[PDB]
């Protein structure tokens, strides 16, 4: 018979299976839709979670009970050292999805980049990317012309520089940032110009801009159904323990449904959260990155005593309104809306 009292189900079925993510790096499921009018531009970046602080800001919401007062907001610091653009990939549209035509590389790639191709870089002899970087400019330009002719989506392979961060990990994080903007030829030229130079956060994003964050949540191992799905604890008198779901299905169907909460892995999930506003893009060069016009004190973002469990933010960074999935030192992908 029917439930005596209705109540919504525990947790969302849209985040199933609650299994461990395949990788540590956040991965863009889909890039923003390309607009042919805008000049070619990068659409994504990668930084590392340093920590969180709070800021004071003046509200400008007419009719809001706050309006003209100064409120405190929690902010997440993402250390964004410049990446290096190292490669170009062209995709064409086929009924079977996007197909790579080819990827062309830069003339020089850092050992930080080559390290990502090795499980044991220290004892190898680092032969990766050694004899394929001496391809003639004739065949490079041939491949680029074919990409311009037939490809409809352009992406730039770029990698982080973990040496500029306090991270112990040395191998860079590599991804491809889709170039959204003008024509195919303009995209090709736009990425060809900066085929080997640094890509700072300032070129990709602006202050006061809403972005999305893609990252892997903080892991917690296997958790009970109570802490994993929020189910209600059984009364204290329960014979074999109370931290469980009482009925895991009706008699029929003579099976357990996939919608029934169970124990299992909690955390270390891939999450794409929308609409985190950039509050400030702090620069490595300046000595007053954490100063304000109402502070005039010479100070940098790193809190007195270092960022706990992270280190010191010696590079470019951005101050994100709110919180971001992942632990400290986690790689965090930032994407344009």
């Amino acid at each position: 018979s029917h439930r005596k009292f209705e109540r919504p189900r525990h947790g969302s079925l849209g985040f199933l299976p609650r299994k461990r993510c395949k990788r540590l790096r956040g991965k863009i499921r889909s890039f923003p839709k390309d607009d042919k009018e805008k000049p070619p531009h990068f659409t994504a970046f990668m930084g590392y979670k340093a920590g969180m602080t709070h800021i004071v800001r003046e509200v400008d919401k007419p009719g809001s009970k706050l309006h003209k007062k100064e409120i405190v907001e929690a902010c997440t610091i993402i250390e964004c050292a410049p990446m290096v653009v190292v490669g170009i990939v062209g995709y064409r549209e086929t009924p079977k999805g996007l197909r790579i035509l080819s990827t062309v590389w830069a003339n020089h790639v850092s050992d930080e980049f080559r390290r990502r191709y090795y499980k044991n870089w220290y004892k190898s002899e680092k032969k990766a990317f050694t004899k394929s970087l001496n391809v003639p400019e004739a065949t490079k330009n041939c491949l680029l012309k074919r990409i311009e002719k037939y490809c409809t989506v352009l992406r730039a392979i770029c990698h982080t520089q973990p040496s500029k961060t306090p991270l112990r990990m040395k191998k860079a994080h590599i991804m491809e940032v889709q170039i959204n903007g003008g024509s195919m030829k303009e995209k090709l030229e736009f990425v060809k110009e900066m085929l080997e130079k640094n890509l700072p956060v300032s070129t990709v994003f602006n202050p006061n801009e809403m972005i999305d964050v893609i990252s892997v949540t903080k892991g917690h191992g296997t958790k009970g159904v109570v802490s994993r799905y929020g189910v209600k604890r059984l009364p204290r008198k329960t014979h074999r323990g109370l931290r469980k779901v009482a009925c895991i299905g009706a008699w029929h169907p003579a099976r357990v449904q996939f919608q029934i909460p169970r124990h299992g892995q909690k955390g270390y999930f891939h999450r794409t959260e929308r609409n985190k506003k950039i509050y400030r893009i702090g620069l490595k060069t300046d000595k007053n990155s954490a100063s304000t016009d109402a502070d005039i004190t010479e100070k940098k973002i790193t809190p007195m005593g270092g960022f706990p469990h992270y280190g010191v933010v010696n590079e470019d960074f951005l101050l994100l309104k709110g919180c971001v999935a992942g632990t400290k030192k986690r790689p965090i992908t930032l994407r344009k809306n």
Binding site: P95, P253, R255, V256, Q257, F258
Partner: peptide, 14 residues
């Protein structure tokens, strides 16, 4: 299959 749609009739749209 309401117990596990992965096992269910795969619908296919092409």
């Amino acid at each position: 299959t309401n117990t596990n749609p992965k096992k269910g009739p795969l619908h296919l749209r092409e």
